[PDB]
Amino acid sequence: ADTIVAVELDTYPNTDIGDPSYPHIGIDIKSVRSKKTAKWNMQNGKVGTAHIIYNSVGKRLSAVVSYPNGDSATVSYDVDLDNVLPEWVRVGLSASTGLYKETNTILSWSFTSKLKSNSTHETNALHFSFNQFSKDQKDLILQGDATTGTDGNLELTRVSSNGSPQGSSVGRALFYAPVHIWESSAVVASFDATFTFLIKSSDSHPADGIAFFISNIDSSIPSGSTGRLLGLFPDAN
């Protein structure tokens, strides 16, 4: 298959596949069944901010998701990503809807990765930030239903003209350039990502969520990965 490391903002409890009974954030290492989760209050129609942070020294993948009123949830998981991810990856955002739906609107996304080594701050680095997306965002690989629009946003999943999110949708956006996420001779490999998002739904139980993910460079939406699989995984194993 792909190799996926992800931080999921999971809006819809799929308890039959190990989701906690409440919306949650989670750290997913090669499985949709998060290695760690934290209860998350998704604030319908509010703009949230997710931060993901890791460095190869601490070997701890951390995420926090917050809303302007100060509510937040955080999850951290100890993992040496050198032993999980390929050396070269692509980084992306994914989202899905299913029977129930929600907008999976990304308003901004930044990412920074650095590899530092042996001597001085002699280093390879990648940093990108999108605080606006354009209709033809050539440095994004859009997959599935993901679109960017003149409205400055990245709609990961289908939204109708009337602004209504659609079910059975899956979409991703990957940064165009592969990222050298680790290297054997790198003394420190660190990355951080931030994205802001607006999940809004008229469904009493919106679904399915948004994820920041890191994958093999040729990662594509696995078949049948709408709904609970968040566009990341081919199955719920």
Ligand X SMILES: CO[C@H]1O[C@H](CO)[C@@H](O)[C@H](O)[C@@H]1O[C@H]1O[C@H](CO)[C@@H](O)[C@H](O)[C@@H]1O
Stretch that binds Mn ion, among 15-23, 74-82, 93-101, 144-152 (CB under 5 A): 15-23
- Stretch 113-132: interaction string toward ligand X, x if CB under 6 A: --------------------
Other CB atoms within a 10 A radius of the CB of residue 16 amount to 8
208 marked ligand binding residue: yes
CB of 167 to ligand X, least distance (A): 5
**By CB under 5 A, residue 10 contacts Mn ion:** yes
100 marked ligand binding residue: yes
Contacts to Ca ion from residues 15-34, by CB under 5 A:
19
99 marked ligand binding residue: yes
**By CB under 5 A, residue 208 contacts Mn ion:** no
- Stretch 101-140: interaction string toward Mn ion, x if CB under 5 A: ----------------------------------------
> What is the DSSP track for 151-182?
TS-EESS-B-TTS-B-SS-EEEEEESS-EE--
Helix (H, G, I), strand (E, B) or coil at 6: strand
Helix (H, G, I), strand (E, B) or coil at 17: helix
Chain-centre distance for alpha carbon 116: 25
Query: Which residues are 189's β-sheet partners?
Result: 115
**By CB under 6 A, residue 100 contacts ligand X:** yes
> Dihedral angle at the C-alpha atoms of 160, 140, 237, 197, nearest 10 degrees?
-50
Other CB atoms within a 10 A radius of the CB of residue 69 amount to 9
Binding residues for Ca(2+): 10, 12, 14, 19, 208
Binding residues: 8, 10, 12, 14, 19, 24, 99-100, 208, 228
